[PDB]
Amino acid sequence: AYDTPLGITNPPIDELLSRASSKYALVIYAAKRARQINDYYNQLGDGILEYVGPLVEPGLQEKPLSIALREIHGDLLEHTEG
Amino acid sequence: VPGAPNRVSFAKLREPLEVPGLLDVQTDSFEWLVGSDRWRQAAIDRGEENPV
Amino acid sequence: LTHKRRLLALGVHPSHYGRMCPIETPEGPNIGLIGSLSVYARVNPFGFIETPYRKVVTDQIDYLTADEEDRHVMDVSPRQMVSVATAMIPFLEHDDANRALMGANMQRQAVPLVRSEAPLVGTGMELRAAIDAGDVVVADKTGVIEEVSADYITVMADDGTRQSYRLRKFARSNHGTCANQRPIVDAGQRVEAGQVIADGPCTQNGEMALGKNLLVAIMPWEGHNYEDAIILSNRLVEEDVLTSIHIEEHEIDARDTKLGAEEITRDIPNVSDEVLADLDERGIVRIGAEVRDGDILVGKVTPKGETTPEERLLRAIFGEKAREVRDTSLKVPHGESGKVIGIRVFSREDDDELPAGVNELVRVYVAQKRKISDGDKLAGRHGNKGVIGKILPVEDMPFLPDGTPVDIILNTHGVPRRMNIGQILETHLGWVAKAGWNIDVAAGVPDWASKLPEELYSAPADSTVATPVFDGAQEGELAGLLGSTLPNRDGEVMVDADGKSTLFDGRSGEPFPYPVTVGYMYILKLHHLVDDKIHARSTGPYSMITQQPLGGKAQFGGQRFGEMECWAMQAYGAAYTLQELLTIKSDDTVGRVKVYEAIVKGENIPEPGIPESFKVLLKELQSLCLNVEVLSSDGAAIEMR
Amino acid sequence: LISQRPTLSEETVAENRSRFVIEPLEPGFGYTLGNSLRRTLLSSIPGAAVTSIRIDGVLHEFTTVPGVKEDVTDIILNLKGLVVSSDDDEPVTMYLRKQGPGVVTAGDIVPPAGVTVHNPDMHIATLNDKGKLEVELVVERGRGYVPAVQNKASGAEIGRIPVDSIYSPVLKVTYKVEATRVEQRTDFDKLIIDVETKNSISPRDALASAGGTLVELFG
Amino acid sequence: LISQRPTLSEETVAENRSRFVIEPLEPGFGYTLGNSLRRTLLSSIPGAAVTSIRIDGVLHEFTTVPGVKEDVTDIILNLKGLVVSSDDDEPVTMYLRKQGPGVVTAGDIVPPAGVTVHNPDMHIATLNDKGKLEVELVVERGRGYVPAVQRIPVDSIYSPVLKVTYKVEATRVEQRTDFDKLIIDVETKNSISPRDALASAGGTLVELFGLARELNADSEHIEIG
Amino acid sequence: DYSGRSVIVVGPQLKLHQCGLPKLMALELFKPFVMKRLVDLNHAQNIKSAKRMVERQRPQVWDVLEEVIAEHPVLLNRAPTLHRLGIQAFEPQLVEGKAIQLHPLVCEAFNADFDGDQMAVHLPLSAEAQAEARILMLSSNNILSPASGKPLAMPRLDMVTGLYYLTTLVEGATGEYQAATKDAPEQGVYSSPAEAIMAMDRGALSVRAKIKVRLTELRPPTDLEAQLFENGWKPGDAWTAETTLGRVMFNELLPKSYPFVNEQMHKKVQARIINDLAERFPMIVVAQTVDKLKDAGFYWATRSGVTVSMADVLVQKQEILERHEAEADAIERKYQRGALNHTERNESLVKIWQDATEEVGKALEEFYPADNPIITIVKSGATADSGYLTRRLVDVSQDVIVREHDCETERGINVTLAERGRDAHVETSAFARTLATDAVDANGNVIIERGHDLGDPAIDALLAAGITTVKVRSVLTCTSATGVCAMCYGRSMATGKLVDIGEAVGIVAAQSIGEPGTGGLPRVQELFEARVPRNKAPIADVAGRVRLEESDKFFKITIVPDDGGEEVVYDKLSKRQRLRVIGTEGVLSDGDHVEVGDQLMEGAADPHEVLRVQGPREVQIHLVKEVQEVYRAQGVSIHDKHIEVIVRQMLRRVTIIDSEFLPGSLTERAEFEAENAGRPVLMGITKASLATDSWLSAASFQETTRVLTDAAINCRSDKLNGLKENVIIGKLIPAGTGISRYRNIQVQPTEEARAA
Ligand SMILES: [Mg+2]
Ligand SMILES: [Zn+2]
């Protein structure tokens, strides 16, 4: 159902909450990954650190925070909860 | 009012006393204060004979 | 007029009846301390409030007061306890005291419209309150007009004396509303004493006109009039019916400064020739010129510090010089535009009066023709109010079988809690007055016309009507007029005896399944406007003592994030969002600059610092002889610096 | 299927307005089709209107002309009621020069070659012995309602004062359907449109421009 | 006059169901032709359908049909879903007679030359044990949806289109964000494709609106070109 | 910075997650963003040039503005901010005009009437801030009120009347179904819902008719589904029912999996539906379902034919009351002398007044058909000081957060749960709880087991078993050393699921109690401050019989103990302090039995009295009982867990009698109990909040001077434990995303996705 999510509401938070423990863990999850993607796109980030991404097919002008949400939705990355 | 437009009134009654000058609340006091000769005409239809 | 006659009650009852109405007390917390004087109230020389009345029914009128309250036996007239603002609400007896109170405040909030069309249905106070307000041109002595011009009007009296009246033309009021006077007479006319020679800003033909007459539909229309919102026809924007002129004054001054006296000049330190193109030889904006956000009004320079290396190099390379100077120009405030109507300049060369040390003073007046726009607050005389939800093109609107679209579309759901019955009454009488009527008496007059006079019958279209507050019309006579409606051009009747009509949806074309109440209601344009109430800020100036942003100046006011908002932000559990607002968006000296830098480069936004509010807190404690120390896990004490 | 092609036949009630009747066609088509033309008539009819005007004595809209009774801001509102027609393919300027006591009407305006004033009887301003009024009106093509085109957008320096332009030859359009013979014999509807104009063009030529607009629209 | 070019796109949800968009449209052009499109798609497309039917052992009885599990009413609703393309344009009586236990799928109805049955898998009725049913049904072309005339007078669904709905949105920010985007959703029967169904409605409107164009062809109108 | 405000207007065409943003407001708000992308392209050579390009509103930037605006959330807020739903996130849409277009559903959450109101906009900047807006504060994710649990986005005022008109049924309608006769068959049947539409368009069908049709894509009522199929659901299978076309079109807005309803939609019926939709479906389905109910509700409100006029309003009553008034006038010819009777008088007046009211009620419904616009609206159900208390509520409970999943404590509190021979307070007290023990039926079979969400389906399932009381975990009994635990707190009212760890309940509980502040408010502050009741009420100090003695001076209540010890007498009680009310019911009389906790007279009992009598745990039950009863008198719906969080902070302190350590400073229970003579102590929220660990949080609460002097002498060091301290110094609050377990997460892609 929910014929098709539009913009911010995609992906649904229900299908996202299965990838992490809490909604708060979801925030730090996608937020730090957005920092990694936006780094990679500008250029290599901090001292002696090579940053990767994006893993999923990027959108036309898709923001780095919207990409990281699609990455978590597909289980393309795991985090250490706590 | 001489140049008043025609406005049909639904009131079947009559108001004999026209509204006094609503601005008289400010003028009558300052004319009493300065002691204007127009307020000195209040002694024409006099009350207390002295316009102090 | 109601600012005068107002009174402060700080020092309900039977003595308040007929002396000072609590009906026009403000809706704020000061209710009860502030009231307006009654219509017929007279003041005794000792300060006592004397109510007029007729001893019982003797024809003489004596002053009633507490002395007359001892021997109390007939009142002078209705609306004794009703003030001027309240006495101008038709069908006042039907609305609630709250809605009657709000209606008074709504009337004194109206803005003068360019057209100034008189009310179609109203009381008898419009005429009497307009002339006595003082903003209308009244004839002093009977005579004949000698000349009539937009500038002045001359009257040739039979006595032989010559009186002339200069008309206020587009004069800026105290709150910025254009005060304009229109001559209503011609040269050949013969005017009697006390007659209206010219209309004021909000008057037409000698009576207060605070709004316009518009065709209304009370059907809810696809949620665009939801809960308070009102939908308008694009006709009102095209025909400038709700358009109003607004004028604002700007001022700037000259020398007597800190490091010396500065001069106002056209020359700006470094700008393009096209930026000052609208500035004159002195440097003031030329009259009649259009100004948008940021444009210079008055050019002015300051004394320099005359004390960067990187800027001097480019200066020496291309030949520009460290001509002092700090640019100090009076620009237009962000978010406003208009045309320059006039400039008043006070110089030092001429001997004029000015403050000590200030050489030159120039004031610029800019006028705006404000079209009605979505978001503007409209209201009627009954206290109803609401923003403009949407402005529909004239093509798609509920329209009568004539093809005549409705101007506004109201909603019904307000009635079954607040009931505001008077709003519906003038809506039907508004249609009765617009289309006229003829009772078509056959074998006498109907029973509803029993208490009526004979002149009320058989009136033509577009006829004004007066219904006094308590002696006015009644429900029976209304429906009788609803049954009599002069048809339109083709002879078809557009409104039944129920005040309803079958409207056609301008979008789908299908007719609306049920008959919808239509009519003419008198609405107002309140001083709250979108152009004044919209604010947006990305970066701007900051206060000196506290490094927080500062709102309330001519540009870029910042929004306040209170603790109540901080409580909601904590309830969501959003720690970062709350930290961003209180440190780098408000008080971080090095934070808000590095964020604007990172945003421009497109980098990550850095971690916030220590808000200046907290650093000021520590010094306030130290000055109180309280030794505070911020200790980490190690390195015992750290100093902010 | 009872097949008889729809037939549009003209009529006349007044000159500025004349009815039109199209019959027959299927049920439910009267209200949806008659309104679709009304929405097109009221908006998209190519018209002729005045874009900006210029008066020698005044620098802006908020002043007064010596001798005249109406202020400039009141004359602009009186000039908003001007109905005009023009081919003009281009911006062209009219002229109005009047002197002495009298009444300045729309007939006193001199239309250049290709344009014409359709309401010479309209009142503009009243002049007296000292009143002298000379103005210049720029007429331009367009449709619908365009607000005043500010000179800050198109440099038309201090002299010209832009005015809201209304290109709408139509005045008032309505319609009513009569579905006859709803019985078991047959089924069909027939409607009549009431089209009114500002005298800029005839009702017949107005409906044609609305018809050609829809014909080229559906694709 | 000249106007910015719109776009006519099509998104197919299913074989018989598709939605169309028109972007952009000057305001207000979405509600002008939108309601006229739906009314033109629905009631203006020619098609053949069932007018009246008759079976064996019916006239006297009303509700029950001995020899079948489905009642009279439920049997009518099935044959209402029967899609038939006839070029005869006149009432033609097709015959359908099947005996013995089984299922009548409209593949057992013998179509006269010139008409067809596009859904031979549609379930008309289930035959009772040792039962027999012979139905003669009238089929004639028509337009739109005509109610029953009042033998088996029934409701005739002449148009191939079944469900048509529309709405409008706002896009095309460039300098005026109120430009209209017309959406229209049409569900059609398999007799014709939705893309050809829309063309028939558009072709009927341009010819209908051509009556006003021919009044004065040279009256200046708008053209996208 | 990066903020603004404007006047709000209705946004009926918006999605729940969208908001209409003026182009100029969005331009200046995103000014640094557009300048960057404008410099990324060659429109402007350098950043200094792009600034003038944005400030002068060159038309080249508007196409760039929609890119930086897309998928970049903004926060909307309307002052005053009462609860957390007063701030929500939306998706900005560039809109012509200077006003703000607000979705018509969030108006109740913002309490935003459309008369001259204004709302403020804030632009999140950091990736963490944008994530918290898209996940925590999104408009569509916040539907249920986090006080009672009911949905706040439920349609209202027009969408109620619009849906009421669509689903209502009128007999004798144009397309009414008629049973088959010998002449013709059934005429009310249609092949599909599509045909009925084609019949509705023509003059053959009324949307409010009683027709019966066949539905394929719509699932049937659960009662009739078992009879018809019993073999499974029917995605493509067909079935027939008798409804109204509107009820058919209404059920298409609901999810396909949801069963058919076939009712005219009341305000309570719709609320009943949205509740069950929220549980059984993800909120995206509930968000889009209510969004579909908005379009239809608004659409049919216009076609509803609701309009006001003289007829539908004008008052019959004239002749009625002119007659009744004369009866009261003639009663003066009787009250004077001869027929007064001094109690027939008052009884005559009350009966005659109510008789006129009864006749007026009949006349109210005697002059209007049931379709009257005002009557239709009524039937459908469409129609400042508090901030002081709220700040103290927030000041005492701001530090209460969930810190662990389970404390594994075995003891909760008893819930009344369904008197029968059905308690209306179970939805507030029993709902959304967690069982401490299993629910055992007398027959031996166990039903809902301990540690269960105790959903509404469980209450009905428990009600079928016929069990009265259940024991439930609570924060009052939570043994967590820090804050509370998820299991004791239970289901989050907003999420509908188990409360998350990061959740800060104390503030949510404080706001939930503070917002209704707008037998009243002065009484509520009396309880939370733990003061002595205005009129003190006696409580039984022991169990036994009671001797009622009535004297002029005052009542006398003597309790004869069952133990046989010294009698307990309660003397000098004002006679106007009426006696307390009680298989056989009635009012307390002489000789009744009274237990230890019974209140002897009507009124308020001293909270300090019951503390030393029943114990600290019975005090918290009594306090919440009286607090809940006040808000119930006004019709407010607050879950008991919110009040229980505030009451939990009062009894946390114990008074050490004397010397080992020294005198009766109000200490902490856990700090005292977990390390090795003291008392349980009840104290007000203002005194309790000042006793918290940190000094510069207590300094900002009340009388900074006294707090600082004591904190200066003792050299009290603030560990920055609470969230107020971190707000003051700009740190990350230790709640929600600031929790150590959450903010220390490490994000790295899987090696399986890296190589790909
Ligand atoms: Mg408000
Ligand atoms: Zn616990």
Residue numbers in the entry:
A (entry chain E): 25 to 106
B (entry chain C): 23 to 74
C (entry chain C): 440 to 450, 466 to 510, 515 to 531, 570 to 803, 806 to 1139
D (entry chain A): 2 to 220
E (entry chain B): 2 to 151, 161 to 235
F (entry chain D): 423 to 737, 740 to 807, 867 to 904, 911 to 1007, 1027 to 1090, 1095 to 1171, 1175 to 1191, 1203 to 1282
Question: What does the literature reporting this entry say, word for word?
Answer:
Semisynthetic derivatives of the bacterial natural product rifamycin (e.g., rifampicin or Rif) are components in the first-line treatment of tuberculosis and other gram-positive bacterial infections. Resistance to the rifamycin family of antibiotics commonly occurs in clinical isolates as a result of point mutations in the antibiotic’s target, the DNA-dependent RNA polymerase (RNAP). To study the inhibition of RNAP by Kang-like congeners, we solved X-ray co-crystal structures of Kang A in complex with both wild-type Mycobacterium smegmatis (Msm) RNAP and a RifR RNAP variant carrying the most commonly observed RifR mutation found in Mtb clinical isolates (Msm RNAP βS447L). Our structural analysis revealed that Kang A binds the same site on RNAP as Rif.
While Rif was inactive against an Msm RNAP βS447L mutant (corresponding to Mtb/Sau RNAP β S456L/S486L), all three Kangs displayed potent activity against this mutant. We propose that the additional interactions with RNAP contributed by the unique Kang moieties (K-sugar and K-acid) stabilize the binding of the Kangs sufficiently to overcome the loss of interactions caused by the S447L substitution, leading to an IC90 for the Kangs against this RifR RNAP that is at least two orders of magnitude lower than Rif. To test this hypothesis, we determined the structure of the RifR S447L RNAP in complex with Kang A and compared it to the structures of the wild-type enzyme bound to Rif and to Kang A. The structure was obtained similarly as described for the wild-type enzyme and was refined to 3.45 Å. In the wild-type RNAP, S447(OG) forms a H-bond with Rif/Kang A(O2) and this favorable interaction is lost with the S447L substitution. In addition, substitution of the Ser by the bulkier, branched Leu residue has complex effects on the Rif binding pocket;48 the path of the polypeptide backbone is altered at L447 to accommodate the bulky substitution, and as a consequence the β-subunit loop from residues 451-465 becomes disordered and nearby parts of the antibiotic binding pocket rearrange, resulting in the loss of nonpolar contacts between Kang A and L427, G450, L449, and R456. These structural changes do not affect other RNAP/antibiotic contacts including, importantly, contacts with K-sugar and K-acid. The binding of Kang A to the S447L RNAP results in a reduced buried surface area of 2940 Å2, a loss of 390 Å2 compared with Kang A/wild-type RNAP. Thus, the loss of 390 Å2 of buried surface area with Kang A due to the S447L substitution is more than compensated by the 450 Å2 of buried surface area gained from the K-sugar and K-acid interactions, supporting our hypothesis.
